[PDB]
Amino acid sequence: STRKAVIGYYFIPTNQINNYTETDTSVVPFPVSNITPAKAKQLTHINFSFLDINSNLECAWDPATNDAKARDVVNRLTALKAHNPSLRIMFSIGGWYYSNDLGVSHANYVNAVKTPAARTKFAQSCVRIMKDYGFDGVDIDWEYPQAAEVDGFIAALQEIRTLLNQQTIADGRQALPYQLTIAGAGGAFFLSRYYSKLAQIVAPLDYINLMTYDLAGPWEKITNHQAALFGDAAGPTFYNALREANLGWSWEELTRAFPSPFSLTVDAAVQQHLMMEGVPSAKIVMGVPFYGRAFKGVSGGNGGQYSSHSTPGEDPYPNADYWLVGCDECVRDKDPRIASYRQLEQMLQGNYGYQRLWNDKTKTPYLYHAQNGLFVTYDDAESFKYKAKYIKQQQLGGVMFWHLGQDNRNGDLLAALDRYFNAADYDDSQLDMGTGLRYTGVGPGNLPIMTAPAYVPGTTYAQGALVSYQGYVWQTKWGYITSAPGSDSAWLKVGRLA
Numbered sequence: 144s145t146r147k148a149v150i151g152y153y154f155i156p157t158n159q160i161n162n163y164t165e166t167d168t169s170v171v172p173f174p175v176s177n178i179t180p181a182k183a184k185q186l187t188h189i190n191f192s193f194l195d196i197n198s199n200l201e202c203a204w205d206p207a208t209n210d211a212k213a214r215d216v217v218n219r220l221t222a223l224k225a226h227n228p229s230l231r232i233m234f235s236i237g238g239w240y241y242s243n244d245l246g247v248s249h250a251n252y253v254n255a256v257k258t259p260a261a262r263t264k265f266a267q268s269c270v271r272i273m274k275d276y277g278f279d280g281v282d283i284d285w286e287y288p289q290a291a292e293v294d295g296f297i298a299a300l301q302e303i304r305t306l307l308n309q310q311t312i313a314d315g316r317q318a319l320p321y322q323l324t325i326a327g328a329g330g331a332f333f334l335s336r337y338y339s340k341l342a343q344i345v346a347p348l349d350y351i352n353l354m355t356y357d358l359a360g361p362w363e364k365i366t367n368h369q370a371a372l373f374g375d376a377a378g379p380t381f382y383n384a385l386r387e388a389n390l391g392w393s394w395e396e397l398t399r400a401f402p403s404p405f406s407l408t409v410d411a412a413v414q415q416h417l418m419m420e421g422v423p424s425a426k427i428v429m430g431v432p433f434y435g436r437a438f439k440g441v442s443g444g445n446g447g448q449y450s451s452h453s454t455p456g457e458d459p460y461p462n463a464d465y466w467l468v469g470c471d472e473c474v475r476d477k478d479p480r481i482a483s484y485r486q487l488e489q490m491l492q493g494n495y496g497y498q499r500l501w502n503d504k505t506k507t508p509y510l511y512h513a514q515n516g517l518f519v520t521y522d523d524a525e526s527f528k529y530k531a532k533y534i535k536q537q538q539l540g541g542v543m544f545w546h547l548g549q550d551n552r553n554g555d556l557l558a559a560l561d562r563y564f565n566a567a568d569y570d571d572s573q574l575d576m577g578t579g580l581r582y583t584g585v586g587p588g589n590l591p592i593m594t595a596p597a598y599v600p601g602t603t604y605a606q607g608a609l610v611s612y613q614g615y616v617w618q619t620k621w622g623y624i625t626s627a628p629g630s631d632s633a634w635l636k637v638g639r640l641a
């Protein structure tokens with residue numbers, strides 16, 4: 144009955160704000176008017192990226208942003224609401240540049256959540272900003288708080304929530320309540336910084352936006368798909384860092400939740416969230432990329448997949464060699480490692496040597512240039528079907544993507560998602576998800592339905608025996624056990640009843 148969310152990030156730089164225009168694709172490639180009325184129906188939210196946090200621990204614009212020009216750009220967005228019953232113009236604070244451990248503004252994020260006084264100051268400053276420009280909510284895309292600074296981050300979220308609720312009340316917005324989201328890590332290494340406190344992080348949120356992409360890059364030893372749905376046994380595996388999180392669980396409970404090594408996939412990140420108690424599927428949103436990640440130096444043999452590579456990982460890109468054959472955006476934006484789906488469809492469609500291939504295990508596409516040893520991992524309307532099925536099957540809240548300004552001018556990626564959830568003509572029940580590797584981890588938040596003979600006191604239970612008791616199914620870790628299930632360390636809760 145309820146609609147899957149469709150959360151589209153929207154980026155525009157400070158300099159394109161201050162020289163903003165609707166008619167010069169040289170000064171502004173993707174201006175607001177680019178977003179049709181029919182497109183504005185297709186999105187539930189639009190995250191206007193990015194604001195930041197200045198030395199005073201307040202939410203702010205880039206010091207050299209011009210207010211009037213900044214203001215005009217937002218009303219144009221908020222205007223879109225006329226076309227859509229449900230649209231929210233969120234604003235997003237953070238991004239990688241501002242908030243990474245060695246980003247420009249990093250310390251501000253640390254100090255803004257460090258104390259009650261600061262959290263008060265900062266949270267007020269978020270809402271103050273939200274109303275003062277017409278925004279329908281707040282997104283916090285801090286990549287990422289670390290253990291000591293997670294508690295404060297939590298508190299910050301709680302504070303903002305309360306202030307959003309006060310404002311929802313004040314403006315009589317029960318029809319469309321001011322919302323709070325974050326962009327969350329989509330991979331175990333980064334997710335392990337706050338994993339143990341995930342239920343508290345999610346509680347004050349309408350959604351957690353899983354950045355289930357950028358899971359491969361130049362930093363890796365080996366080329367890999369950046370947003371594989373399921374795992375390919377030919378591909379690389381990784382250490383499950385979540386088995387070392389401060390959870391206080393037993394060896395069995397850890398082993399059962401965190402297989403290691405494992406495949407770094409979308410399914411993996413989602414199940415990892417589901418495994419925690421108090422994290423409802425409905426709040427979990429699957430990110431997907433509207434860009435492609437490009438590698439060079441790939442030895443052939445297997446489509447450029449899982450190969451050693453010569454892609455620099457420095458920031459910024461350290462030279463003037465734009466090797467990504469026939470990507471103008473890469474020249475103008477000065478980085479060949481990232482390309483929009485717009486620019487990718489060109490590259491392929493053109494006369495270029497690129498070969499679009501398909502991995503039937505990961506259900507993702509990838510471009511292979513055999514002449515120049517190039518490999519590109521990305522998503523398209525074809526992979527989006529399998530990701531759309533998963534969202535349904537697993538009963539997630541919907542989809543997020545980065546970003547809208549990297550879809551084409553028609554907007555067929557956006558339209559393809561909207562189709563897979565909504566459009567009544569569309570169907571995907573026969574769609575084969577394949578024999579890709581699933582994350583099989585089980586935790587206390589995603590216990591499978593099971594049955595077993597009822598436990599009987601006085602009975603001696605061997606290693607492995609299963610019984611039913613007080614609503615749950617239990618399993619003996621060793622034998623022979625006579626204690627009541629749950630009363631000592633010999634029992635493992637493996638499933639639930641009825």
Ligand SMILES: C#CCO[C@@H]1[C@@H](C)[C@H](OC(=O)NCCCCNC(=N)NC(=O)NC)[C@@H](C)C(=O)O[C@H](CC)[C@@](C)(O)[C@@H]2OC(C)(C)O[C@H]([C@@H]2C)[C@H](C)C[C@@]1(C)O
Nearest residue numbers: 152154156238239240284326354357459460477478481545
């Ligand atoms: C998203 C992102 C990463 O940040 C970019 C910037 C870092 C770009 O990175 C990029 O697009 N990488 C894609 C992978 C995504 C992994 N994180 C992620 N998906 N997060 C997420 O979904 N959050 C919701 C790069 C191409 C770039 O343009 O960087 C130039 C230098 C080449 C900057 C550093 O000068 C850059 O210039 C512009 C283009 C004007 O953008 C600003 C920034 C100052 C901006 C502050 C950062 C910015 C949005 O582009």
Ligand SMILES: C#CCO[C@@H]1[C@@H](C)[C@H](OC(=O)NCCCCNC(=N)NC(=O)NC)[C@@H](C)C(=O)O[C@H](CC)[C@@](C)(O)[C@@H]2OC(C)(C)O[C@H]([C@@H]2C)[C@H](C)C[C@@]1(C)O
Nearest residue numbers: 243244245330332333357358359360361362363364381456
């Ligand atoms: C390569 C390399 C060495 O560089 C490292 C840094 C580059 C790490 O090095 C590395 O590749 N290690 C072997 C990888 C196997 C596991 N696989 C894996 N972790 N995959 C994964 O997380 N997918 C999303 C990389 C995994 C990393 O975490 O890079 C992130 C972006 C994904 C950075 C670029 O944001 C990174 O973030 C932190 C962790 C804060 O550190 C800095 C840097 C800003 C730092 C400059 C980079 C630095 C030292 O960790």
